[PDB]
């Protein structure tokens, strides 16, 4: 059911100058089959030494506004100034050895990097983020003492003080795999300011809890087993091809159970058949010719029940155009047992123009919140919807026209963009195209999420706080920019109501506390990669609910891009079921209990959905009601000049690893 009249006589032309530099790229856009294709010309200007000085997307060339980027290079070809129209201006200075010395980002924050002196090998020592002067990072290197060589610590960064605390490294294997590390966190009333020489006045800024984790690895450096920070041990086994074939978990004080008892693979190393300690068998089918995933068949071999069977169809180029489920509808939807077919169509640039699927009945309009679960008692159904998307010539999603018949909830939602930038907010915030760039930082990070919500950002462009009305939610990040803390402070009932999550290797320490006491303490043991059928274990140390049982195993079952759609217990019964709108909004949401729905945190593309609605994708935050990122691309023009675009506006076939 693919129509090739969309793609006739629409090639991609890269026009060259007399130096064979790509000075124009040419695209032809046909949205529907009968009409003519539209030539889009992206312009790249080069100076006389041959570096790309300015680049211009085809929408701002029609506006007669300036270029997207204005770069200034040195004589070697490295960028000294980059005046991006979405990410602001970046002034970068490197030394002789091409190490960064001075970085000024668009918010005016000067970053320093001081190194070792000329008698030492010149490794990194400290980083200073001057705004008024903070030594925000501090690296402690090791020597070649025979105590250091016993643990292979020679020439490593043993203590690494960063924006979230301390990351101490204890032992290395003979390959170079870290076998033991520990980490403390900065306290809530303190920021990273690691000034001075003595480290005894840096431990009074850190927490008392030192979270150490341990590993064991084979001679090939693959991780065999891993002890968490509490003592829960995961243990993996490998087959003769070096792939992974098994998994065992032993909680602290308990025996060793089985999480994955078999995992076979195809010839190309893709997953082929996997049986869990649940007992449920999933089986992946592939194309012979192209080795594309054409089937995910989740079968429970105790009732001969197929829980889901997703058969994918594709374009010739590899765009998902048809997903049908040959399973029956679950126990949450009474009186119906046929799952509708999801059909997708695309433009000539392979961006999603239309999408059908199923959604709940009492969902209403899509927003930042997720709807209430469909319990097995309230006998509710699902209905059919179809969404149609519209784009401008910069690739920004400008309009989602959700038209759902048989319920009369037909709504459109517009994204109001700038004329000079790709910065565009929802139409609830501003209807004027000229007051959109007042809602962003100078670096292009959005500063207001909703009409009553404001966002605060770090000096290095990371989300520091989502201010709601009465209750904020703030985060902390390490030197790589990965989130190590999430503290949700609800307003005053008689005191603050604080929920704290600590992100550790293979462990989430979700805890809830009032004024003086902890009212809930939850240790989520994770097994595997999120989006790769992850298994979670919810262990309650304090404040367990009445109806749930302790050490509850939640086996996640994922679709093509990793959206967690089915959760099963250790016996194989369904805990919670979810479907998604194509750009990530929760369309269908059924659960066994309301309190068993509160602990599903990883939802779409294997990414954790916060209480603010934003998905945390690594280096950036994503907002699914708009299909935009919350900030500009931190890496730059990796994927085109649109720094705010989603996955080439192709969110069914593609998915973004880690945001950047």
């Amino acid at each position: 059911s693919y129509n090739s009249a969309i793609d006739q006589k629409t090639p991609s032309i890269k026009v060259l100058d007399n130096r064979k530099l790509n000075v124009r790229t040419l695209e032809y856009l046909r949205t529907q089959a009968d009409e003519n294709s539209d030539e889009l010309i992206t312009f790249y200007e080069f100076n006389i030494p041959g570096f790309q000085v300015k680049s211009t997307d085809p929408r701002k060339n029609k506006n007669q506004s300036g270029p997207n980027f204005i770069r200034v290079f040195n004589l070697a070809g490295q960028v000294l100034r980059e005046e991006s129209v979405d990410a602001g201006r970046t002034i970068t200075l490197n030394d002789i050895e091409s190490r960064p010395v001075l970085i000024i980002n668009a918010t005016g924050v000067r970053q320093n990097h001081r190194y070792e002196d000329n008698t030492l090998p010149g490794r990194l020592l400290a980083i200073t983020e001057q705004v008024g002067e903070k030594t925000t990072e501090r690296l402690i290197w090791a020597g070649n003492t025979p105590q250091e060589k016993d643990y292979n610590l020679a020439g490593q960064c043993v203590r690494h003080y960063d924006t979230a605390g301390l990351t101490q490294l204890n032992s290395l294997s003979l390959a170079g795999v870290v076998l033991s590390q520990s980490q403390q966190l900065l306290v809530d009333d303190k920021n990273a300011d690691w000034t001075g020489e003595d480290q005894s006045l840096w431990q009074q800024k850190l927490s008392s809890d030192v979270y150490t984790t341990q590993n064991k690895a084979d001679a090939t450096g693959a991780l065999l087993t891993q002890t968490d920070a509490k003592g829960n041990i995961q243990r993996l086994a490998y087959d003769v091809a070096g792939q992974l074939k098994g998994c065992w978990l032993t909680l602290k004080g308990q025996a060793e159970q089985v999480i994955i008892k078999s995992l076979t693979y195809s010839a190309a190393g893709q997953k082929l058949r996997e049986e869990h300690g649940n007992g449920v068998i999933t089986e992946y089918s592939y194309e012979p010719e192209t080795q594309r995933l054409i089937g995910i068949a989740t079968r429970r071999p105790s009732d001969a029940k197929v829980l889901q069977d997703l058969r994918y169809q594709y374009d010739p180029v590899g765009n998902v155009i048809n997903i049908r489920n040959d399973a029956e509808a679950t126990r949450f939807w009474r009186n119906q047992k046929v799952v509708p077919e999801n059909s997708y169509t695309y433009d000539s640039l392979y961006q999603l123009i239309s999408a059908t699927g199923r959604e709940m009945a009492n969902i209403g309009q899509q927003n930042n919140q997720l709807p209430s679960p469909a319990l097995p008692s309230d006998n509710n159904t699902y209905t059919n919807y179809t969404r149609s998307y519209s784009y401008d010539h910069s690739g920004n999603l400008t309009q989602i026209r959700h038209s759902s018949p048989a319920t009369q909830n037909n709504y459109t939602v517009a994204i109001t963009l700038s004329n000079r930038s790709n910065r565009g907010v929802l139409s609830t915030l501003t209807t004027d195209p000229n007051q959109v760039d007042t809602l962003f930082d100078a670096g292009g990070h959005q500063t207001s999420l909703l009409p009553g919500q404001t966002l605060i950002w770090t000096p290095r462009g990371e989300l520091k706080q989502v201010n709601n009305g009465p209750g904020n939610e703030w985060y902390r990040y390490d030197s790589n920019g990965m989130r190590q803390l999430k503290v949700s402070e609800q307003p005053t009932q008689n005191t603050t109501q604080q929920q704290r999550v600590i992100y550790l290797p293979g462990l989430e320490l979700r805890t809830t506390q009032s004024n003086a006491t902890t009212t809930e303490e939850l240790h989520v043991i994770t097994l595997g990669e999120a989006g790769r059928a992850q298994v979670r274990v919810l262990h309650w140390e304090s404040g367990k609910p009445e109806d749930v049982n302790n050490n509850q195993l939640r086996y996640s079952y994922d679709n093509l891009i990793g959206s967690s759609q089915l959760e099963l217990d250790n016996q194989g019964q369904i805990i919670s079921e979810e479907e998604y709108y194509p750009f990530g909004g929760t369309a269908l949401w059924a659960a066994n209990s309301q309190t068993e729905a509160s602990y599903k945190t990883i939802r779409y593309s294997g990414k954790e959905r916060d209480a603010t609605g934003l998905y945390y994708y690594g280096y950036r935050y994503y907002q699914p009601w708009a299909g935009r990122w919350l900030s500009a691309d931190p890496a730059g023009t990796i994927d085109g000049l649109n720094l705010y675009r989603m996955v080439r506006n192709n969110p069914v076939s593609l998915q973004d690893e880690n945001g950047l």
């Binding site: 990965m482 293979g506 990669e529 790769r532 192709n650 076939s653 998915q655 973004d656």
Partner: peptide
């Protein structure tokens, strides 16, 4: 960066 479905990559249980 926008990559394809998760099935293409090798398994990874522990990294940074």
């Amino acid at each position: 960066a926008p990559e394809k479905g998760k099935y293409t990559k090798e398994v990874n249980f522990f990294d940074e």
